[PDB]
Amino acid sequence: KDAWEIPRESLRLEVKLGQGGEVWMGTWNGTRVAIKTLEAQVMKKLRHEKLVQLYAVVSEEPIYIVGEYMSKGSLLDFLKGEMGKYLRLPQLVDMAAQIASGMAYVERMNYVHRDLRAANILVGENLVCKVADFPIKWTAPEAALYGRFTIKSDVWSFGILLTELTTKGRVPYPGMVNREVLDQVERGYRMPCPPECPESLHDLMCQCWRKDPEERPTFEYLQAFLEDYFTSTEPQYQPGENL
Numbered sequence: 001k002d003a004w005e006i007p008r009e010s011l012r013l014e015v016k017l018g019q020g021g022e023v024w025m026g027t028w029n030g031t032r033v034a035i036k037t038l039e040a041q042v043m044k045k046l047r048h049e050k051l052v053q054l055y056a057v058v059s060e061e062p063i064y065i066v067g068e069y070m071s072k073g074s075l076l077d078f079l080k081g082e083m084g085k086y087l088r089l090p091q092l093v094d095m096a097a098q099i100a101s102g103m104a105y106v107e108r109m110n111y112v113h114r115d116l117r118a119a120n121i122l123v124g125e126n127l128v129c130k131v132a133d134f135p136i137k138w139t140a141p142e143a144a145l146y147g148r149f150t151i152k153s154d155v156w157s158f159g160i161l162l163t164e165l166t167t168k169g170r171v172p173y174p175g176m177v178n179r180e181v182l183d184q185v186e187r188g189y190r191m192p193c194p195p196e197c198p199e200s201l202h203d204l205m206c207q208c209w210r211k212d213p214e215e216r217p218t219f220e221y222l223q224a225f226l227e228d229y230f231t232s233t234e235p236q237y238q239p240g241e242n243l
């Protein structure tokens with residue numbers, strides 16, 4: 001036991017959110033939190049404002065891990081919902097930048113987030129997106145074939161995450177099954193520019209999807225590129241029908 005340990009008595013459950021374990025909403029010290037029932041020692045070293053904050057942990061069966069409650073659930077559910085109809089490119093590039101901001105912290109800390117996708121991004125209020133929950137379509141070849149998981153395989157997945165955003169939560173490589181993707185991507189296939197998406201944003205995706213992992217961008221580059229986007233790259237942006 002360490003200083004992250006708390007009394008299970010100090011937590012009140014209220015609303016169940018999901019299952020799979022089970023995730024609960026509730027109150028701590030009479031503050032609102034989320035409880036994930038039955039580890040995440042990785043969340044102890046990591047403390048960034050675009051990462052879902054770990055609050056506590058009950059270290060005996062049944063295990064309760066307590067973190068900050070993100071009020072809109074996954075980014076995927078948030079895009080497939082009533083909001084994705086209104087979301088345009090500035091709102092999505094904003095979201096992509098917060099995610100890249102979190103993964104650039106991960107990059108500095110020399111960590112790897114093996115499963116990076118919109119199901120694992122959590123949304124709160126005012127388009128706050130945070131990285132959490134530390135997939136052949138989202139996975140880079142070197143990782144899916146030879147196990148070479150690097151921050152550069154996460155750059156690849158982030159580039160796929162950029163397709164999820166620009167498509168309002170569509171599944172990448174549409175119409176293609178897993179083995180069809182593996183064999184296609186190996187042969188050099190990359191997804192084309194999504195509808196109403198600037199080629200400048202798709203050019204960025206194609207950088208994240210380079211053959212050689214070392215020639216891919218950093219999130220430090222990615223988050224800088226995305227924050228400066230509507231000034232340095234597309235200051236000529238007019239809102240289309242969907243983007």
Ligand SMILES: CC(C)(C)n1nc(Cc2cccc3ccccc23)c2c(N)ncnc21
Pocket residue numbers: 017018023034035036043052053054055065066067068069070071073074122132133
């Ligand atoms: C979508 C749904 C599965 C219901 N979900 N999942 C989470 C993750 C999560 C939950 C509880 C504690 C955590 C502690 C550290 C890191 C993440 C934690 C989560 C959350 N914070 N807030 C709201 N919903 C959440």
